[PDB]
Design an enzyme around this catalytic site. Sequence first.
Site, PDB file in Angstrom:
ATOM      1  N   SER A   1      -6.768  -2.129  -1.050  1.00 40.49           N
ATOM      2  CA  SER A   1      -5.930  -1.211  -0.342  1.00 40.49           C
ATOM      3  C   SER A   1      -6.493   0.180  -0.499  1.00 40.49           C
ATOM      4  CB  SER A   1      -4.491  -1.384  -0.858  1.00 40.49           C
ATOM      5  OG  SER A   1      -3.552  -0.474  -0.467  1.00 40.49           O
TER       6      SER A   1
ATOM      7  N   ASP B   1      -2.008  -6.972   8.255  1.00 40.86           N
ATOM      8  CA  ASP B   1      -1.780  -7.830   7.067  1.00 40.86           C
ATOM      9  C   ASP B   1      -0.409  -7.565   6.434  1.00 40.86           C
ATOM     10  OD1 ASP B   1      -2.004  -5.499   5.731  1.00 40.86           O
ATOM     11  OD2 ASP B   1      -3.659  -6.042   4.416  1.00 40.86           O
TER      12      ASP B   1
ATOM     13  N   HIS C   1      -1.622  -8.544   2.664  1.00 42.83           N
ATOM     14  CA  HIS C   1      -1.928  -7.435   1.766  1.00 42.83           C
ATOM     15  C   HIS C   1      -1.692  -7.738   0.285  1.00 42.83           C
ATOM     16  CE1 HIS C   1      -3.300  -3.275   2.168  1.00 42.83           C
ATOM     17  NE2 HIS C   1      -2.586  -2.993   1.093  1.00 42.83           N
TER      18      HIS C   1
END
Length: 392
Positions: free
Chosen positions: A111, A315, A356
């Site tokens: 991320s 995601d 994610h």
Amino acid sequence: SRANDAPIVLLHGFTGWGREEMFGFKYWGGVRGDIEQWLNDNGYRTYTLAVGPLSSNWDRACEAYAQLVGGTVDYGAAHAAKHGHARFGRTYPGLLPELKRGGRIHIIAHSQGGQTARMLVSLLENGSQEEREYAKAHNVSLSPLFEGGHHFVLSVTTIATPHDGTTLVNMVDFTDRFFDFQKFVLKAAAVASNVPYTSQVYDFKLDQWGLRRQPGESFDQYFERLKRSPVWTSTDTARYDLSVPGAEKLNQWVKASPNTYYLSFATERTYRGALTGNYYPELGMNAFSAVVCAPFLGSYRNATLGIDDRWLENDGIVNAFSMNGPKRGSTDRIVPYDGTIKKGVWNDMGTYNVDHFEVIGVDPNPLFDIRAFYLRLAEQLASLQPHHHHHH
Ligand SMILES: [Ca+2]
Ligand SMILES: [Zn+2]
């Protein structure tokens, strides 16, 4: 096979914490286990960094540096004066003192950690002309991070990173939705957000801003204070760097080093509606991403900002389009992987069908062989040559 023995360093995103936080529940592995431990067990020396989850990539870079070599966090005098926070932060022992003597590392970031990693590599190699100029004009000391000339990073690997930002920041209600992910990770770890735990549990590491969870204040209460603080209202924030405009700004100065390998992995957990052209969350996606975030991402267009249909796949948190590497405002070159990992450019490793949070094991997904993924990634990183000879 193995060609280097550089240690691996893990780096989280807008959510993340140290090995001792969340009562041991790992960011890197979550309900799955302990990613770092898996790598160490299989012969890949690996360490974990923990910086400010909501802090600006810059702040996070400074923290990472210190955390890697040891010493007291120095955010830079020009920077600190500009944004109105403390110049010096928390002190660290240093995970890898070997870096001060020629060593190198591989960074695996998730991320927002990918933006942080790229910035770290940029500062280490080129320093900050601004910081350098300010010190000369004002007689202040200067952090070695802003001088340039460091060659510590053999590679940077990003997973589900918003290189071009994420349109999630455009939701009218982003503020509340974003903190809800702060509640989600707390929930994954079996921690309540409505309880004033006396134990720290999750330290946002906001020492520069002088913010901390106070006695008698639950996370819910704290989050509401944060929402009103400079870590949420300033441009020197993850909020800002996460936005499309913000990321673009970052990309205009944060360049790929010719001396570093960059690998990019993208994530997608959506399907396309045949009539709307929109993307919808797949079965298996966490409720915090699926209810309002994933659908917003899969349907939000903005032609003036240049958000088109390419951006809809996501995601649950980041637009897949923004993951293969920086594009908006960037001079970096991206090449689809072909079986050879090239130096100084983004090697687009493709798109994986994982969300994610399933990618780091925070959300379950029995169909995703997380161990294999990371072991294969390590194998790949250990096979990189620190010096590539030119040939036919
Ligand atoms: Ca899942
Ligand atoms: Zn700052």
